[PDB]
Amino acid sequence: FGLMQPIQEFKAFIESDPVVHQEFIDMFEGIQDSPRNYQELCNMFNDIFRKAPVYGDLGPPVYMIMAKLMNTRAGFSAFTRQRLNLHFKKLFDTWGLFLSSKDSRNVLVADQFDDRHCGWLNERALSAMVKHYNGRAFDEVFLCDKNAPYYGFNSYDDFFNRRFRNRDIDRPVVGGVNNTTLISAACESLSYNVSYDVQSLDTLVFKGETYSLKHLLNNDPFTPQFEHGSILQGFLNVTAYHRWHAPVNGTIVKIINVPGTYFAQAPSTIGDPIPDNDYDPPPYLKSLVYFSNIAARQIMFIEADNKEIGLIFLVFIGMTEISTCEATVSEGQHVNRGDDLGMFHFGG
Amino acid sequence: XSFALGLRKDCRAEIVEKFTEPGTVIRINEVVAAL
Ligand SMILES: NCCc1c[nH]c2ccccc12
């Protein structure tokens, strides 16, 4: 018994507005398993935010218990209120403090916890994390000490944001850093979508639930330069490297952090089945283009050294509890393709 | 999680074709657009 203070304030907020309160009743209709009501949700949050994630689920822990709620009109309505998302930001920031602490190392173990969950140093998790590294082992790919407790990592966040030990072997800057005509992937990912001739929309309703430049870029003055342009979007799954690399030789022009959503899926998907497996995508993972427009996100404009490439943008797009976007470069700084650019964290 | 790379219409670097198919592996630092 007893809830951490940010959760108590979250619960008070829910009960402060009758319409918000009613959404937090309706979104649970017909639900059989925990969480069955918003009190249980708060209790389960209180446990999740004092633990680190383990390996085995399709997504991180808050997503896993929110997915059914996101998949309702009442949930979507609640989760697209900026007042409520201020609380989610506070909650995930609080969890982030724990995940940066030494206490969060207790999942960086080789233990198997049950049939489907294990510590991040269990062979099942290690192998999953090096699937795309051509047979090299975790401790070859990533900077760590395989002979130290917790592989030498200081926290769950340190492990989450592990670095490459020898990127020239495992993730080379293909074509050579000095070739200014090439643009590299900023994140280790799976392709999600490519759109051409992109435009702005007045509303994010119907219309293929596609990109709207003025939404995505939060009405930046640069937005018109990208009308009729193209966008490549990637998805970083739960085992991917989660740091950002510079995509081009160029200068950081502008960095904008935009408050937004955490649990908003595309409205057209509300009610679709949530598969009970890790290979058939659930509705939220069919919504990445839609919520690129509204999720908590960071926009970064870069002026390439090669002016035939010129001004480009990156948007780092939050997903549920993994929504903190930290740039480690400053406006006006020159970067080369492949350089450290920033990273995602658990947080708001 | 996700990230988006945005290119202007006049950008001579064009997105590499294989990435238009969803689910394709994107190795960080590999080329995703080129002149
Ligand atoms: N960034 C790890 C992948 C991730 C974040 N939120 C999710 C929600 C569902 C599935 C995956 C994710």
Q: Is B17 on the interface with A (CB under 8 A)?
A: no
* Structure token digits, residue A347: 């947080």
Residue type, position A175, single letter: G
Q: Coil, strand, or helix at residue A305?
A: coil
> In which domain, by residue range, is A9 found?
5-102
A296 inside domain: yes
Burial of A49 (0-12, 13-18, 19+ CB in 10 A): buried
Q: Are A192 and A234 in contact (CB under 8 A)?
A: yes
- Both A221 and A323 in a single domain? yes
Nearest-Cα residue of chain B relative to residue A211:
B4
A171 inside domain: no
A150: left (phi over 0), alpha (psi -120 to 50) or beta: left
The residue with tokens 């202007």 is: B8
Q: Are B26 and B32 in contact (CB under 8 A)?
A: yes
A49 inside domain: yes
- Both A79 and A16 in a single domain? yes
Residues, chain B: 35
- Both A205 and A223 in a single domain? yes
Residue type, position A146, single letter: K
A212: left (phi over 0), alpha (psi -120 to 50) or beta: beta
DSSP A80-133: T-HHHHHHHHHHHHHHHHHHTSGGGGGGSS--B-SSS-B-TTSHHHHHHHTTTS
* Structure token digits, residue A3: 């809830």
Write the CB contacts of A319 (distance below 8 Å, at least 6 apart in sequence). A63, A284, A288, A295, B2
Q: Which residues line ligand 1 (CB under 6 A)?
A: A 58-60, 63, 236-238, 284-285, 319-320, 322
- Cα(A43)–Cα(A49) distance, rounded to whole angstroms? 10
Residue type, position A34, single letter: S
What atom in ligand 1 is closest to the CA of residue A235?
Answer: 3
What atom in ligand 1 is closest to the CA of residue A240?
Answer: 2
- Cα(A323)–Cα(A316) distance, rounded to whole angstroms? 9
Write the CB contacts of A219 (distance below 8 Å, at least 6 apart in sequence). none
* Structure token digits, residue A204: 């994010």
For residue A136, the number of C-alpha atoms closer than 13 Å in the C-beta half-sphere is 16
Residues of B in Cβ contact (< 8 Å) with A316: 2-3
The residue with tokens 């920033």 is: A342
- Both A242 and A155 in a single domain? no
**Domain end: A160, A185, A207, which one?**
A160
- Cα(A275)–Cα(A217) distance, rounded to whole angstroms? 32
Q: Are A181 and A312 in contact (CB under 8 A)?
A: no
A169 inside domain: no
Q: Do B2 and A227 touch (CB under 8 A)?
A: no
The residue with tokens 């999942």 is: A107
Provide the 8-state DSSP code for A302. Answer: E
Q: Coil, strand, or helix at residue A76?
A: helix
- Which contacts of A10-18 are long-range, i.e. CB under 8 A and separated by 24 or more positions? A10/A42, A10/A45, A10/A87, A10/A90, A10/A91, A11/A38, A11/A39, A11/A42, A13/A83, A13/A84, A13/A87, A14/A38
A65 inside domain: yes
- Both A108 and A81 in a single domain? no
- Cα(A200)–Cα(A293) distance, rounded to whole angstroms? 10
- Cα(A252)–Cα(A299) distance, rounded to whole angstroms? 11
- Cα(A264)–Cα(A76) distance, rounded to whole angstroms? 6
Write the CB contacts of A86 (distance below 8 Å, at least 6 apart in sequence). A259
- Both A223 and A269 in a single domain? yes
* Structure token digits, residue A122: 């269990």
Burial of B22 (0-12, 13-18, 19+ CB in 10 A): middle
Experimental determination approach used? X-ray
Residue spans of the domains in chain B: they are 2-35
**Domain end: A52, A80, A102, which one?**
A102
Distances (CA, A) of A54 to A66, A75, A76, A117, A130: 17, 26, 27, 6, 17
Give residues 246 to 275 of A whose Cβ lies within 8 Å of B: 247
- Cα(A145)–Cα(A64) distance, rounded to whole angstroms? 31
Provide the 8-state DSSP code for A347. Answer: B
Tell me which residue of A320, A298, A63, A93 sits closest to A187, measured CA to CA: A298
DSSP A136-181: --HHHHB---TTSGGGG-SSHHHHHTPPBS-HHHHS--TT-TT-TT
In this structure, the residue with its CA closest to atom 10 of ligand 1 is A59
For residue A338, the number of C-alpha atoms closer than 13 Å in the C-beta half-sphere is 19
Q: Are A345 and A318 in contact (CB under 8 A)?
A: no
- Resolution in units of Å: 1.6
- Both A305 and A259 in a single domain? yes
Q: What strands lie across the sheet with A324-327, from one edge to the other?
A: A243-245, A340-345, A324-327
* Structure token digits, residue A282: 């659930």
A170 inside domain: no
Give residues 130 to 149 of A whose Cβ lies within 8 Å of B: 132
Is the four-CA dihedral A64, A68, A73, A74 of positive or negative sign? negative
**Domain end: A58, A80, A102, which one?**
A102
Tell me which residue of A227, A306, A212 sits closest to B7, measured CA to CA: A227
Residues, chain A: 348
Q: Do B31 and A216 touch (CB under 8 A)?
A: no
Q: Coil, strand, or helix at residue A53?
A: coil
Distances (CA, A) of A259 to A68, A127, A267, A301: 24, 35, 20, 17
* Structure token digits, residue A208: 């293929």
- Both A325 and A298 in a single domain? yes
Distances (CA, A) of A19 to A53, A74, A247, A265: 33, 10, 45, 20
- Both A130 and A278 in a single domain? no
- Both A222 and A311 in a single domain? yes
A29 inside domain: yes
- Both A151 and A132 in a single domain? yes
The residue with tokens 């969890």 is: A95
Tell me which residue of A243, A172, A232 sits closest to A198, measured CA to CA: A232
Across the strands, what pairs with B5? Answer: A232, A314
In the reported structure, the alpha carbon of residue A280 is separated from the centroid of ligand 1 by a whole-number distance in angstroms of: 15
* Structure token digits, residue A255: 């960095």
Q: Are A161 and A109 in contact (CB under 8 A)?
A: no
Measure CB to CB from residue A230 to each of B15, B28, B30 and give the nearest one. Answer: B15
- The answer to whether the peptide bond before residue A35 is cis (omega within 30 degrees of 0) is yes
What's A196-237 look like in SS3? CCCCCCCCCCCHHHCCCHHHHCCCCCCHHHHCCCEEEEEECC
Give how many domains chain A has, as a whole number. Answer: 3
A168 inside domain: no
- State the CB neighbour count (10 A cutoff) for residue A168: 10
- Both A227 and A287 in a single domain? yes
